[PDB]
Amino acid sequence: DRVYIHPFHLVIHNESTCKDPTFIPAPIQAKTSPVDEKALQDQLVLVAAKLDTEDKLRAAMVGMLANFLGFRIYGMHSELWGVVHGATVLSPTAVFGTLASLYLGALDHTADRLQAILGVPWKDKQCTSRLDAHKVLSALQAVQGLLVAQQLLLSTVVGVFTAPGLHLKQPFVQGLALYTPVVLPRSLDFTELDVAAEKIDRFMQAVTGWKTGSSLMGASVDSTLAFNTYVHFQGKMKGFSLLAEPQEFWVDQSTSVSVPMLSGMGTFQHWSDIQDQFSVTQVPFTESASLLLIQPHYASDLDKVEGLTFQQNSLNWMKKLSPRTIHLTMPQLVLQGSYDLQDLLAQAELPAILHTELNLQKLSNDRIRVGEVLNSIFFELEADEVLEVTLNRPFLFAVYDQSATALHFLGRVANPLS
């Protein structure tokens, strides 16, 4: 039958769609080849170039769902950036994919309560009403390719670290492959969290080359699973050059810091909301991919303007933009941060879903006790009459792809270096 309770008809099971091999992941110290990002990129544009009409529509639908979940997380936090360690950056698509990956191996209420957080309700307990995890995970990889299909590099890596002797069901890892080709299941002993974390740090650093440095803070010794998602972004600025001399960045009224600055001159979409007092600048990476820069007219209104950024009307002022001849000067961004979804979605009772009456039996029939659910981000901006736009004070930024209507990152820059 036709769906009415929600317009997300392409993410649920259809009529047709709606004794398992296992294995121990090799020990983490087992030498593994590094990630060939260049090869990964080619696979992602291929995925996007050969999409069917329906799959292309489902990709935009997931990007829209990921945006809504991001807006929810901000509304349920008195202080959002106290949970994030390192750079204050957030990836709605990665958070949505991490939960969709947990929902892949969930059952019964655990799967329903996860489907609720993802933002798709049900009017009954029919199989059809539930989410099709395969279609969701496959659609996320589509928006990854739709971003780099057109200067841009996006690499998503998943690390499933299990306890020694824990059997992971083959079909589960086979489902994660729909999300990203780079799935890294490895077995790790959780009886020494201090060294167990150091094994992951060097393992991920050797495999990827990116530092993450997560010491398994929220994890305990009885834990048996560490589901981590690592994303790396690298964007080239159209016609921007790195200035040899730094400039001052005012973290507050009293103190400033010298920082490397990017300078560029081009016709950019711009808008200044007078009532709320903030300006929005758009620097395109491609035609459908661009960088949104939100600067409050006065630094004291940062938290306020951010409240208007993390909402659905933020996408309404993509129309209010207008072409302008602008000379933009902003800091060089090489950011690294991380955050646990259990802390992000604490007010949504995610820690209660992952620790009480847990049912991840499609992931593994062995007993599971979540140590951490991590999102590690490595964000980079690189170089190649008039309204001067200078970001010499805290500001907000966002990356948006029109092809999939997806917000890949939402960040805050209070200090370019830390």
Ligand X SMILES: *[C@@H]1O[C@H](CO)[C@@H](O[C@@H]2O[C@H](CO)[C@@H](O[C@@H]3O[C@H](CO)[C@@H](O)[C@H](O)[C@@H]3O)[C@H](O)[C@H]2NC(C)=O)[C@H](O)[C@H]1NC(C)=O
How many residues touch ligand X under the rule CB under 6 A: the total is 4
Q: How far is the CB of 360 from ligand X (least distance, A)?
A: 22
Q: Which is nearer to ligand X, 139 or 399 (CB)?
A: 139
Site pattern 318..357 for ligand X (x: CB under 6 A): ----------------------------------------
CA pair distance 412, 329, nearest whole angstrom: 17
Scan residues 15-74 and list those touching ligand X (CB under 6 A).
Answer: 15-17
Q: Which is nearer to ligand X, 59 or 163 (CB)?
A: 59
Q: Which is nearer to ligand X, 12 or 204 (CB)?
A: 12
Q: How far is the CB of 9 from ligand X (least distance, A)?
A: 11
Q: How far is the CB of 78 from ligand X (least distance, A)?
A: 42
Scan residues 233-292 and list those touching ligand X (CB under 6 A).
Answer: none
Q: Which residues contact 262 (CB under 8 A, 6 or more apart)?
A: 237, 240, 241, 242, 243, 328, 329, 330, 331, 332, 381, 383
Question: What are the E-state strand segments in 188-321?
Answer: 225-236, 240-242, 247-249, 257-259, 261-273, 278-284, 289-296
When asked if residue 174 is in the footprint of ligand X (CB under 6 A), the reply is no
The DSSP bridge partners found for residue 230 are 157, 376
Query: What tokens were used for 1?
Result: 């039958």
Ranges of H-type helices in 310-393: 341-344, 350-353
* Helices 170-179, 92-104: crossing angle, 10 deg rounding: 160
Q: How far is the CB of 56 from ligand X (least distance, A)?
A: 15
CA pair distance 67, 69, nearest whole angstrom: 6
CA pair distance 278, 272, nearest whole angstrom: 6
Q: Which is nearer to ligand X, 118 or 133 (CB)?
A: 133
Q: Which is nearer to ligand X, 15 or 388 (CB)?
A: 15
Q: Which is nearer to ligand X, 17 or 347 (CB)?
A: 17
Q: How far is the CB of 137 from ligand X (least distance, A)?
A: 12
Q: How far is the CB of 145 from ligand X (least distance, A)?
A: 19
Q: Residue for token digits 């995925």?
A: 47
Q: SS3 of 159, please?
A: strand
Site pattern 7..26 for ligand X (x: CB under 6 A): -------xxxx---------
Q: Which is nearer to ligand X, 13 or 369 (CB)?
A: 13
Q: Which is nearer to ligand X, 136 or 353 (CB)?
A: 136
DSSP run (H or E) holding 68: helix 53-75
CA pair distance 171, 54, nearest whole angstrom: 25
Q: How far is the CB of 15 from ligand X (least distance, A)?
A: 5
Scan residues 198-227 and list those touching ligand X (CB under 6 A).
Answer: none
Q: How far is the CB of 120 from ligand X (least distance, A)?
A: 16
The residues binding ligand X (CB under 6 A) are 14-17
